[PDB]
């Protein structure tokens, strides 16, 4: 076939430890004679789909696990077969991540999570609850200095927050991600949103604090706490901060649920040497050997295999990602997160500033996660009916009456789409130029439609 017998063949990316997985093909070549190639190249995530569309590229591709979805949902993916014992050693909670339509898509490799960073200078032992952070800033404004820090402008900064008592972004039951139940506007967010909010009311934090500038009050050492990843560590070294890394507070008395980003191993589907894969990723890499090879080339964090893991997890930075991750909630792998990121983004954007309420945001932000799906679903649908299937530079806001899109009888078509997708009606009187100006202004018609039968 396309793809050579006998071999594995590995795709990477640079900023990992290849040379470390390298050492490891050479262990598994010692014992097999199967000779292993690791390769980093440029853009390999969208390269990838395109040999495997062909039935070529790699045997087999690391990357985080919410691009694993698509390559699924292609069918690019070979289903894994590892038997229960040996998922046993794995935290169980990695394997929700590489599940696709109920089949096991890739291997969990290591996995990445929001700690609470805190200074162990002014404040050496940090609060396990977020209702105590007020106080603790009194009694550190009045030093000089604040207690929390952190990124406000996005979602992914502010969400373990507004997860914690009940919020959620797309539901998943049957290992199937429900796309219509999106939960941003429940109590729980609304608790949690109402706290964040209460606490730049009561000049506890900034609403323009965002990414570079808590980083650099905490690295300066004016605050007692931020919010930040493995990511940000180095900059705290190079800083001179006297810095920890633990588990982030409570709210109503539950865990703060940052999302969780898992670094995953899958096969190719057009890989013949799948057996080989298997072999090489349960016996060689997902091992204490395997692993702190890769990890002494370039850290992984906190890995998946609970043997390894309970050893790395000495290092008490390291058992709050894992710790966190535990308590959070797995990245949802399929294409509508953009559409929760952006309802999400403006929603707290929004309540931050006190332009909206708690409740009026919320609700907001299921109406405008609803639209930002719509937008999607009808660029593709004019881009596969009226452009020959090109997306390209179709976007919301471009002029349809420009395009060759609406003709003397299609704008029926377009109307009863717009019908079908959002079961409201649409009289002769909406159909002209300034409702199909655009997808956004389609968009925005059908919500001003369903918001006047409401
Ligand atoms: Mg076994």
């Known amino acids: 076939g396309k793809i050579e017998e006998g071999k594995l063949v590995i795709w990477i990316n640079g900023d990992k430890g290849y040379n470390g997985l390298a050492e490891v093909g050479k262990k598994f070549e010692k014992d097999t004679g199967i000779k292993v190639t690791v390769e980093h190249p440029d853009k390999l995530e969208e390269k990838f789909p395109q040999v495997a569309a062909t039935g070529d590229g790699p045997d087999i591709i690391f990357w985080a696990h919410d691009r694993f979805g698509g390559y699924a949902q292609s069918g690019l993916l070979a289903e894994i077969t590892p038997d229960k014992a040996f998922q046993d050693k794995l935290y169980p909670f990695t394997w ?250 403006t929603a707290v954007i929004n309540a931050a500033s006190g332009r909206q309420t708690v409740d009026e945001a919320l609700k907001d932000a299921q109406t405008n996660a609803a639209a930002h799906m719509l937008e999607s679903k009808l660029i593709q649908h004019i881009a596969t009916q009226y452009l020959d299937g090109d997306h390209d530079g179709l976007n919301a ?12 009888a299609s704008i029926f078509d377009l109307v009863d789409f717009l019908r079908q997708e959002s079961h409201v009606a649409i009289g002769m009187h909406e159909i002209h130029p300034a409702n199909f100006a655009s997808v956004q202004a389609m968009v925005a018609l059908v919500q001003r439609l369903q918001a006047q039968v409401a």
């Open 96 to 345: 929700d991540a590489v599940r696709y339509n109920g089949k096991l898509i890739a291997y969990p490799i290591a996995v990445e999570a929001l700690s609470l960073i805190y200074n162990k200078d002014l404040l050496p032992n940090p609060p396990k609850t977020w209702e105590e952070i007020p106080a603790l800033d009194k009694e550190l404004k009045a030093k000089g200095k604040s207690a929390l820090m952190f990124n406000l402008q996005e979602p992914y900064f502010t969400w373990p927050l507004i997860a914690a008592d009940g919020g959620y972004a797309f539901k998943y039951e049957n290992g199937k991600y429900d796309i219509k139940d999106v939960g941003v506007d429940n109590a729980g967010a609304k608790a949690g949103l109402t706290f964040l909010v209460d606490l730049i009311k009561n000049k506890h934090m900034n609403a323009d604090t965002d990414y570079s500038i808590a980083e650099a009050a905490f690295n300066k050492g004016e605050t007692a706490m931020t919010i930040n990843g493995p990511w940000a560590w180095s900059n705290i070294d190079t800083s001179k901060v006297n810095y920890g890394v633990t588990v982030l507070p409570t709210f109503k008395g539950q865990p703060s649920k940052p999302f969780v980003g898992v670094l995953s191993a899958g096969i190719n589907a057009a890989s013949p040497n799948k057996e080989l894969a298997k072999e090489f990723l349960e016996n060689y890499l997902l091992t204490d050997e395997g692993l702190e090879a890769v990890n002494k080339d370039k850290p992984l964090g906190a890995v998946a295999l609970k043997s390894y893991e309970e050893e790395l997890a000495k290092d008490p930075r390291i058992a709050a990602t894992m710790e966190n991750a535990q308590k959070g909630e797995i990245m949802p792998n399929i294409p509508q997160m953009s559409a929760f990121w952006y309802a999400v983004r």
């Open 397 to 408: 806001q471009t002029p349809l009456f420009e395009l060759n899109v609406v003709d003397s």
